[PDB]
Each structure stands twice: as C-alpha cells, then as structure tokens.
C-alpha cells in the first residue's frame, strides 16, 4: 500500500536527518580547525572523493555530496 | 585531531548512503504505484511537508529535501 510506503519514507527521513545533523556538526568542526591552522582546503582530493562516493546514486548523488559539503561551511545569522 | 574527524565523516557517509539508497527505492516504488493508479502527485501537501522537515537545517536543508525527492523520480539509461 502506497500510504504504508510513505510512512516508511517518514521514518527514513528521521534517520537521515539525525545523521545529516551529526555530519554537519563534524564538518563545521573540521572547517574551524582547518581555518584555525591556516590549513588548505582539500577540494581536489578529499571533497572530490566524497562526491565520487555519492556518485554511486547517479548525477543527483553528486548534488547530494555538494549539499552535504555546503552544510559544513557555515551561513550567517 | 582533524584527520580523526574526517574518518568519522567517512563513516557517517557510509550510513547516510545506505539510507538514501533505501529511501530512493521506496520513493521509486511510490512513484510507480501512483502512476499505475493515475494518482495525483502530492506536491503542495506531502512534498512540502518533507521540505519543511529538512528546513530545520536551514536553506541547505530545503535543497537536501528537493534532492531526495528527485532521487525518487527516475532518470534515463
């Protein structure tokens, strides 16, 4: 039943949200530590590897990786 | 240590990828069932609610929701 499938989507979104929040926190901590050290951003190596990993899902996986990296980089209040 | 934080990112990405794959499968199944019934797409209600849920993360959360919905909708081979 389609509505039963939708209930599961909502449960999956709970798990995903929990993980994405944790990931964003870890990402932000890396960003701060890096900037505190004057460390070089790892765009061509590590970030590219994150993108490649999610590429498994096709082109939309690349966009997902990009968004997860973005969540790590801060926004203004 | 920053590199230890990076190791955790990679572990979080494993969990997230597993979940996103499952979500995409459930989403695709909904899409098919809906189109098999001539069912109306729930953009204004349900999809908006998914977007609102991820909005917790700020504007980038809205984009994350959009991408997860997109993963459900198919691409060509």
Swiss-Prot record, chains A, B:
The formation of the complex with AroG activates the chorismate mutase activity by more than two orders of magnitude to a catalytic efficiency (kcat/Km) typical for chorismate mutase. This activation is primarily caused by a more than 30-fold-decreased Km value, but also by a four-fold increase in kcat. The activity of the complex is inhibited by phenylalanine and tyrosine by about 70 and 40%, respectively. Changing residue 74 to A: The catalytic efficiency and the affinity are 5 and 3-fold lower than the wild-type. The activation by AroG is 10-fold lower than the wild-type. GO terms for biological process: amino acid biosynthetic process; aromatic amino acid family biosynthetic process, prephenate pathway; chorismate metabolic process; salicylic acid biosynthetic process. Keywords: Amino-acid biosynthesis, Aromatic amino acid biosynthesis, Cytoplasm, Isomerase. Chorismate binds at residues 34, 43, 47. GO terms for cellular component: cytoplasm; plasma membrane. It is an enzyme of class 5 (isomerase). Pathway: Metabolic intermediate biosynthesis; prephenate biosynthesis; prephenate from chorismate: step 1/1. It is found in: Cytoplasm. Residues 1-77 form the Chorismate mutase domain. Its EC number is 5.4.99.5. The record marks 34 as: Important for catalysis. The keyword Membrane does not apply. One of its GO terms (molecular function) is chorismate mutase activity. Homodimer. Interacts with AroG. This is Intracellular chorismate mutase. It comes from Mycobacterium tuberculosis (strain ATCC 25618 / H37Rv).
């Amino acid at each position: 039943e389609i509505d039963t499938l939708r209930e599961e989507i909502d449960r999956l979104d709970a798990e995903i949200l929990a993980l994405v929040k944790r990931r964003a926190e870890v990402s932000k901590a890396i960003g701060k530590a890096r900037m505190a050290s004057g460390g070089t951003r790892l765009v061509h190596s590590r970030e590219m590897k994150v993108i490649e990993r999610y590429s498994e899902l096709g082109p939309d996986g690349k966009d997902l990786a990009i968004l997860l990296l973005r969540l790590g980089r801060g926004r203004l209040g």
